[PDB]
Amino acid sequence: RGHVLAVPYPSQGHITPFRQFCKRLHFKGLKTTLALTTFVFNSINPDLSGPISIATISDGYDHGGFETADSIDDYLKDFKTSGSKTIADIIQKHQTSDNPITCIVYDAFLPWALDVAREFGLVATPFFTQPCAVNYVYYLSYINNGSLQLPIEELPFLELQDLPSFFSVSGSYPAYFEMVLQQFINFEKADFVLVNSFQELELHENELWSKACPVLTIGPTIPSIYLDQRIKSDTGYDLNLFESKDDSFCINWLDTRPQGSVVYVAFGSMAQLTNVQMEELASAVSNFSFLWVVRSSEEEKLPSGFLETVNKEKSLVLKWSPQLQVLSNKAIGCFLTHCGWNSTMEALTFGVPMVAMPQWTDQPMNAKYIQDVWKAGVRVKTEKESGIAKREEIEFSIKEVMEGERSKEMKKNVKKWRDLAVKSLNEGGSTDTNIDTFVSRV
Ligand SMILES: O=c1ccn([C@@H]2O[C@H](COP(=O)(O)OP(=O)(O)O)[C@@H](O)[C@H]2O)c(=O)[nH]1
Ligand SMILES: *[C@@H]1O[C@H](CO)[C@@H](O)[C@H](O[C@@H]2O[C@H](CO)[C@@H](O)[C@H](O)[C@H]2O)[C@H]1O
Ligand SMILES: *[C@@H]1O[C@H](CO)[C@@H](O)[C@H](O)[C@H]1O
Ligand SMILES: O=C(O)c1ccccc1O
């Protein structure tokens, strides 16, 4: 008779793994309530794929969300204040109910949630939505104090341009940098540490980070239908902040294309590219058959007249994609990606080789593992005066994944991950066992 209150950070790349993890807990017999901010809750269009219980909380920006904050530091500060009160509201209200909350799974970005869980005598477990290698680097910085020493002794192959953007773009995003460092301020006092990865994907880094902490890999959070198929209702991502266009057009359009012919291009839910970068992309893209996601707020930055000179026989532009169905479609030749962790793990488990074009935060690390560890893609060369990828380098990287000699080797190397993820989610696998360890304790 346990009840987990799950609290993601209010963004798509964090709500999705949290929701998928709750579906796994429901399948194991554990009730969950998902705590969403009021702005996010009123932004979702509910087409559910499974049972869901949602409580709303506040970050202090119910009306406008993050865009109405004065600054990133004010947003996180108000969210700790408002979010701590409204999380406590849910726990207190449920204390006289059939199933009082017994545990808080909270986003590692929000370590103040452990203070609330302690105040009510609850089990507390941070949930890291980024891979073990990224988190371990941040842990090493924190136990120093905000500084990392290259080379990292137990990971000597990493260079400065492989690190999270906060290290290589000096002074960038100081409040977000303090946030990722402060994920470890009280993890000492946490019962477990949960991570959206699976052990066979980063054995070395999972082993290293586990010496410091009790870490439980519980991923990948990809819907059950694509992998182990143990959860029959888990057919897709069902908490979308972005309207889905009514997905059939894009997937009908992909079915007409020859196998491996389409270059899929997407940058996640919040990355913003410059006009100069959009033009180098739009030029490089146009030498190929492509499916490119440009979010509605980014359409301004494409060259004027572009969305009409597209060749509609071979190519298509969307505001948002059904990315899971896109990546499982065999018209896809390769994935030009910003290397957000969900998109990386989705590309890996589906066997789609990548052109890595990291933009910031943990993306450079994922780009490095994509190219040099998993050997499932190549990283675009960026010119150093700008940080920008020129169209000729973007085109070279696409062709290297689409057709070169290492292209054939990268396709077989990435096809191994599906069965390893499936094995991990099935009975007796590392993730399935780690979920049972967590459920037993709760
Ligand atoms: O057009 C799109 C682009 C992204 N995604 C989903 O949005 C999530 C993006 O998370 P990620 O960690 O890759 O990037 P972030 O948005 O956090 O930068 C992923 O689950 C993708 O499958 C989608 O459904 N349609
Ligand atoms: C972190 O700061 C960045 C700006 O540097 C914000 O864009 C980001 O806000 C996210 O933006 C998404 C839309 O692009 C929303 O889906 C998400 O809820 C919101 O958190 C900040 O988190
Ligand atoms: C932070 O800056 C990056 C570029 O470095 C951009 O991709 C994001 O949109 C912004 O939040
Ligand atoms: O939403 C994310 O994926 C994210 C990742 C790193 C830093 C800040 C963020 O909002």
Find the CATH number of the domain harbouring 237: 3.40.50.2000
Residues 224 and 241 in one domain: no
User: Does residue 278 sit in the same domain as residue 347?
Assistant: yes
Residues 240 and 206 in one domain: no
DSSP string, 178-242: HHHHGGGSSGGG-S-EEESS-GGGSHHHHHHHHHHS-EEE----S-GGGTT---TT--S----SS
Pocket of ligand 4 (CB under 6 A): 11, 13-14, 176, 361
| Structural domain that includes position 350 | 230-423
Regarding whether 69 and 190 lie in a shared domain, the answer is: yes
Residue 207 and residue 174 share a domain: yes
How far from 442 is each of 121, 434, 436, CA to CA, in Å? 12, 13, 10
Closest ligand 3 atom, residue 360 Cα: 5
Q: Are residues 361 and 272 in the same domain?
A: yes
Q: Are residues 64 and 135 in the same domain?
A: yes
Q: What Cα–Cα distance (Å) separates residue 279 from each residue in 303, 389, 392, 401?
A: 6, 10, 12, 21
What's the Cα-to-Cα distance from 191 to each of 2, 206, 208, rounded to whole Å? 15, 18, 19
**336 plus 289 within the same structural domain:** yes
User: Which residue, 63, 83, 79, is CA-closest to 71?
Assistant: 79
The answer to whether residues 206 and 283 belong to one domain is no
Are 262 and 290 spatial neighbours (Cβ–Cβ below 8 Å)? yes
Centre of ligand 4 to C-alpha 186, Å, is 20
Mark whether 237 and 347 lie in a shared domain: yes
Using the atom order of ligand 1, give the atom closest to the CA of residue 268. 16
341 marked as binding residue: yes
Shared domain check, 336 and 316: yes
Is there a contact between 398 and 263 (Cβ–Cβ < 8 Å)? yes
Neighbouring residues of 248: CB distance < 8 A, sequence distance ≥ 6: none
Method in brief: X-ray
Strands 316-318 and 289-293: parallel
Cβ within 8 Å of residue 188, ≥6 positions away = none
Give the closest residue (by CA) to ligand 4 atom 10.
Answer: 11
DSSP reduced 3-state for 99: coil
Number of domains in the chain: 2
| Residues 404 and 432 occupy one common structural domain | no
